Every structure is written in structure tokens, then in C-alpha cells.
Amino acid sequence: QNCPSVCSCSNQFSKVVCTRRGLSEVPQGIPSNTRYLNLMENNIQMIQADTFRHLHHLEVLQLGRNSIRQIEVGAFNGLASLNTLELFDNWLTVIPSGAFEYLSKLRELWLRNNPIESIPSYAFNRVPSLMRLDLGELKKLEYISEGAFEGLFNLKYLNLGMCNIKDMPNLTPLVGLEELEMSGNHFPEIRPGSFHGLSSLKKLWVMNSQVSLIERNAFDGLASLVELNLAHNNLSSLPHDLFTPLRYLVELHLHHNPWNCDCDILWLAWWLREYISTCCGRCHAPMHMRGRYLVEVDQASFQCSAPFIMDAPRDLNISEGRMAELKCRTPPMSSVKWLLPNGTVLSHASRHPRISVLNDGTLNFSHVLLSDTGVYTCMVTNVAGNSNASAYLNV
């Protein structure tokens, strides 16, 4: 019916601002008309059960920049209209999974900059309506469960940046994820398994992550990819035909990388001239190319070698059940694919249950079967040309 003394309302009565106060607790008489409530820059330590029980029109609850340590099970009861829940910059050490109970209209959950120690299994599963989740700046994060992101069928945005993550979490349940923010972590190598099951991904940000190498066919599974940000890393080159299966890739951020402008960047220099100016940065090496933008790098003054298959695959006589290898020592940046006798083509990205293509080009088997008999061709490609070498696998 009326505005609280420690708060400031608006003519609509939609907006209630209670910022820059010495509040240790949430105001007692918040009007039922409220759509947007601001409770930032206060000393609130605990959100008691049924606190906002009668605020049925509340769309945005701003609880950011406070001292919130505990959130009770029924703290968010009666919040049928809640779309945005901002809980960033608090003292939360555990995700309040029970508190996010009946929030059927919740689309945005900001939990960034919190002393959250662990993301347990099936957390956020009680909110399948969630579309935007920010778990950034979690400096005290020690554990992420494999089933942590389970139940989030409608999630389109995930921010897990500045969490000091050393190895990629299981993002497979996020089937409909379109935007991923992984910037500010530690990933020296980007593997094809790192982003497995992210078919719907359109935007990928892996800035300031100390990336020194991107493995062969790493982004191959990311068919829907529109935007890729790999800026501010230690990248000197990218594998041949890395962006070729990315039919929808139009926005690229490749700057602040110590690019080695030799025959290996020529495919990229062509790709950017044909599909994309201030987006990709400059050559840091060799000295003759230093300072030039990779978009302005001209192949017209380049003399290149075709793929050198230094060690062609050797013929193998092996018994059923044994592990077998077909080596293919080729320049590390070249494109490598394997043609099996059945006619199927395998890459480093392929998820075959027995036969795997390693990053060095070698074809691993784990255990051979009677059906694995015939000619296996190592197919290598560069900007200068292509090379092929076959081997016969017996039993």
C-alpha cells in the first residue's frame, strides 16, 4: 500500500530502490505492486524464508553487493513473476539449490564474484526454466561435479570465466547452449573433447586463458558457431582447415596472439580475406613479417612445401585383441584424416569406440578385431597441396 522509510518508490510504484543504506536485513513493508526491487550496497547477511512471499509482481530482485552468507529453503517463495535474480558479490560458499524451488519464470541467475567452493551434482536442476547463468569470478572454486549442469535443458548462456579452471567441465547436458564464456581460466591446449556435445553453440569466448596450442579438428563439432574469441593468448598458428567445417563462422577475435607468419598461417590469411580488419591482430614472427596484420599477409610472395609424410604408415601383422598403431609423422600444423577400408573417414575429433586419430597423426586401435583387415590411408593436406600414404593391416 505504501513505500518503506528506508526505501524510495516511483510513481508507477513498480520500482523500489533501497540502496546505499546500513541495512543488515530486508525492509519489512515492501509494496505488493513492486516489479523491480533494488537492495544493493547494504550489509544483509541472511535471506530468511518467505521474505518476499507477497511480492507476486516482482520481475527483478537485486541482492548484489551485500554480505549474504545463508539463503533459507523458502526464501524466494511467492515470486511467481521473478525473471532476474542477482546474487553477485556476496559471501555465499555453497549454491542454495533448495532456495531455487518454485521459480518457474526465472531466466537470469547471477551468482558471480562469490566464495562458492563447489558446484555439486544436479545443482540448478530445480530451475529448468533458466536461460542465463553467471558463475563467473569464483576464485575459491575447488570442485565441479560431472552432473553439475544437469537439468538445465533451456540454458542459452553460461559464464564460467575467471574461475581458475585448469580442465574443462562436463557441458554435455547443456544441449541448447548458444553462448559460452570461458575467458580468464587456464587452458594451454584446446582439445576436440573440451567442447563435446555443444552442437547449438553460436558464441565461444576463451580470452586470457594462456592458450598455446589448438589441437587438430578442435572446433569441428561446433557446427552452429557464429562467433569465436581466442584473443589475448599464446597462439602462434592454427591447424589447417580449422574453420572449414564452420559454415556459419562470421565473427572472429584473434588479436593479442604472437602469430608466426609462415606457410602455416596462409590458409587463415586467405580465410579472413574471403570471409571477413582490426579483428585478428599482427604477425610477431618471422622478423620480415613482424608488424603486418594477418589479414594483409599476401601468399603471392610465399614459397611453400606440400605436406611431408616423414614416416609413412607401416604394414602390420597383429593378433586379435592386441593394440595396433599406424604412424603418420607429418608437420604438426597440417590437416590429417584417415580413410578406413569400409570407406569411412576419421579425424582427431571422431568419437569411434576403438579407432582413434591422435594429435601426432598416428591411428590408434586399442584392441583389433577380425573385421579390421584392408588398406588404411593417411590423408594429409596443406595450403601448398596434399599427400597420401597407405598401409595393410592383417588380422
Partner 1 sequence: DYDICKSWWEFYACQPKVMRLKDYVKVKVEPSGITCGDPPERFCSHENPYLCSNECDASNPDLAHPPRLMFDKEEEGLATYWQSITWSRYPSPLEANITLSWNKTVELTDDVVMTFEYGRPTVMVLEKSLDNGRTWQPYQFYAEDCMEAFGMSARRARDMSSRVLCTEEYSRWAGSKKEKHVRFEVRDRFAILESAKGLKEFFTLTDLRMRLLRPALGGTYVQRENLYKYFYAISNIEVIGRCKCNLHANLCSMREGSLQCECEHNTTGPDCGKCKKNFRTRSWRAGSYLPLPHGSPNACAGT
Ligand X SMILES: *[C@@H]1O[C@H](CO)[C@@H](O)[C@H](O)[C@H]1NC(C)=O
Residues near partner 1, by CB under 8 A: 8, 17, 19-20, 40-41, 62, 64, 86, 88, 108, 110, 112-113, 132, 134, 136-137, 157, 159, 161-162, 181, 183-184, 207-208, 229, 231-232, 253, 255-256, 278-279
Residue nearest to ligand X (CB): 317
Residue in the structure block whose three cell numbers are 586401435: 365
> Per-residue string for binding with ligand X, 173-192, x by CB under 6 A?
--------------------
Residue in the structure block whose three cell numbers are 533458466: 130
Give the separation between CA 26 and CA 242, rounded to whole angstroms: 53
Q: How far is the CB of 317 from ligand X (least distance, A)?
A: 4
Q: Rank residues 126 and 132 by Cβ distance to partner 1 and give the closer one.
A: 132
The one of ligand X, partner 1, none whose footprint includes residue 69, by CB under 5 to 8 A per kind, is none
The one of partner 1, ligand X, none whose footprint includes residue 159, by CB under 5 to 8 A per kind, is partner 1
Q: What is the DSSP secondary-structure string of 161-220?
A: TTS--SS----TT-TT--EEE-TTS--SEE-GGGGTT-TT--EEE-TTS---EE-TTTTT
- With CA atoms as reference, report the closest residue to 223 among 204, 239, 237, 208: 204
Q: Rank residues 103 and 326 by Cβ distance to ligand X and give the closer one.
A: 326
Give the separation between CA 120 and CA 94, rounded to whole angstroms: 9
28 is a site residue for ligand X (CB under 6 A) = no
The one of ligand X, partner 1, none whose footprint includes residue 168, by CB under 5 to 8 A per kind, is none
319 is a site residue for ligand X (CB under 6 A) = no
Residue in the structure block whose three cell numbers are 527483478: 60
Q: How far is the CB of 367 from partner 1 (least distance, A)?
A: 46
Q: How far is CA 317 from CA 328, 346, 354, in A?
A: 18, 22, 18
Taking a C-beta distance cutoff of 8 angstroms, is the pair 130, 155 a contact? yes
Residue 102: exposure state from Cβ atoms within 10 A (0-12, 13-18, ≥19): middle
Q: How far is the CB of 394 from ligand X (least distance, A)?
A: 6
Give the separation between CA 232 and CA 28, rounded to whole angstroms: 48
| Pairing status of strand 356-357 against strand 179-181 | unpaired
Taking a C-beta distance cutoff of 8 angstroms, is the pair 311, 329 a contact? yes
Q: Which of residues 375-394 bind ligand X (CB under 6 A)?
A: 394
Q: How far is the CB of 337 from partner 1 (least distance, A)?
A: 33
50 is a site residue for ligand X (CB under 6 A) = no
The one of ligand X, partner 1, none whose footprint includes residue 315, by CB under 5 to 8 A per kind, is ligand X
The one of partner 1, ligand X, none whose footprint includes residue 132, by CB under 5 to 8 A per kind, is partner 1
Q: What is the 3-state secondary structure (H, E, C) of 118-158?
A: EECCCCCCCCCCCCEEECCCCCCCCEECCCCCCCCCCCCEE
The one of partner 1, ligand X, none whose footprint includes residue 124, by CB under 5 to 8 A per kind, is none
> Per-residue string for binding with ligand X, 250-289, x by CB under 6 A?
----------------------------------------
Residue in the structure block whose three cell numbers are 525473471: 83
Letter string b/e over residues 194-204, b meaning 16 or more CB atoms within 10 A of that residue's CB: bbbebeebbbb
Taking a C-beta distance cutoff of 8 angstroms, is the pair 181, 206 a contact? no
Q: Rank residues 321 and 353 by Cβ distance to ligand X and give the closer one.
A: 321
320 is a site residue for ligand X (CB under 6 A) = no
Give the separation between CA 258 and CA 233, rounded to whole angstroms: 8
298 is a site residue for ligand X (CB under 6 A) = no
Q: Given candidates 142, 167, 315, 360, which one binds ligand X under the rule CB under 6 A? A: 315
The one of partner 1, ligand X, none whose footprint includes residue 257, by CB under 5 to 8 A per kind, is none
Sign of torsion over alpha carbons 270, 271, 277, 281 = negative
Q: How far is the CB of 288 from partner 1 (least distance, A)?
A: 19
Q: Rank residues 144 and 363 by Cβ distance to ligand X and give the closer one.
A: 363
The one of ligand X, partner 1, none whose footprint includes residue 317, by CB under 5 to 8 A per kind, is ligand X
Give the separation between CA 264 and CA 335, rounded to whole angstroms: 11
Q: Given candidates 317, 319, 342, 371, which one binds ligand X under the rule CB under 6 A? A: 317
The one of partner 1, ligand X, none whose footprint includes residue 334, by CB under 5 to 8 A per kind, is none
Residue in the structure block whose three cell numbers are 602455416: 264
Q: How far is the CB of 176 from partner 1 (least distance, A)?
A: 17
The one of ligand X, partner 1, none whose footprint includes residue 142, by CB under 5 to 8 A per kind, is none
Q: Which residues bind ligand X (CB under 6 A)?
A: 315, 317, 394
